């Protein structure tokens, strides 16, 4: 299954929408650039299962997305550890533009 997360709410709020997503192995999360760009998607090393920097760096899309409809996807395959992956947008960090993917297992 694919879950679409908007970067910037339709309401014009600096939020990921939905901010919290629960996922099963094999699912994809697709971020779509929506309102009030730019946005990016950063996972800190201590905010993914096992605190793996190698994992968090692979998943982080640090490059800025400016155009509506730009997208980035992660397929959380069985290669991914179960647990929480907490992320944020650097440009809007002070606005609380944060999210969390929970991979069940
Ligand atoms: Cu943002
Ligand atoms: K993070
Ligand atoms: K940062
Ligand atoms: Zn860190």
Describe the structure.
It is a peripheral membrane protein. This protein is mainly beta. It contains one helix and nine strands; from the N terminus they run βββββαββββ. A hairpin with an 8-residue loop joins β1 and β2. The relative contact order is 0.29. The protein binds copper (II) ion, potassium ion (2 copies) and zinc ion (ZN). Copper (II) ion binds next to loops. The site of one potassium ion (K) has 7 residues, from β5 and β8.
Would you report the number of β strands? Answer: 9
Overall CATH class: Mainly Beta
Largest sheet: number of strands, sense, barrel closure = 5 strands, mixed
| Order of strands in the sheet with most strands | 3-9-8-5-6
Task: Assign the CATH architecture.
Answer: Sandwich
Q: What does the overall shape look like?
A: globular
Query: What Rg is obtained from the alpha carbons, in whole angstroms?
Result: 13 Å
**What helical percentage do the residues reach?**
under 10%
The N- and C-terminal alpha carbons lie at a distance of 16 Å
Number of domains: 1
| H and E string | EEEEEHEEEE
Helical segment count: 1
Q: What fraction strand?
A: 35-45%
Bound molecules: copper (II) ion, potassium ion, zinc ion
Function: Participates in electron transfer between P700 and the cytochrome b6-f complex in photosystem I.
GO molecular function, one term: electron transfer activity
Binding site for Cu cation: 39, 89, 92, 97
Protein name: Plastocyanin
């Amino acid at each position: 299954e694919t879950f679409t997360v908007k970067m910037g709410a339709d309401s014009g709020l600096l939020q990921f929408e939905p901010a919290n997503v629960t996922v099963h192995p094999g699912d994809t999360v697709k971020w779509v650039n929506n309102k009030l760009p730019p946005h990016n998607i950063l996972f800190d090393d201590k905010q993914v299962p096992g605190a793996s920097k190698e994992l968090a760096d692979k998943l982080s899309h640090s490059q800025l997305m400016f155009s509506p409809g730009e997208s980035y996807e992660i397929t959380f395959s069985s290669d991914f550890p179960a647990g929480t992956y907490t992320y944020y947008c650097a440009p809007h960090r002070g606005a609380g533009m944060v999210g969390k993917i929970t991979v069940e297992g």
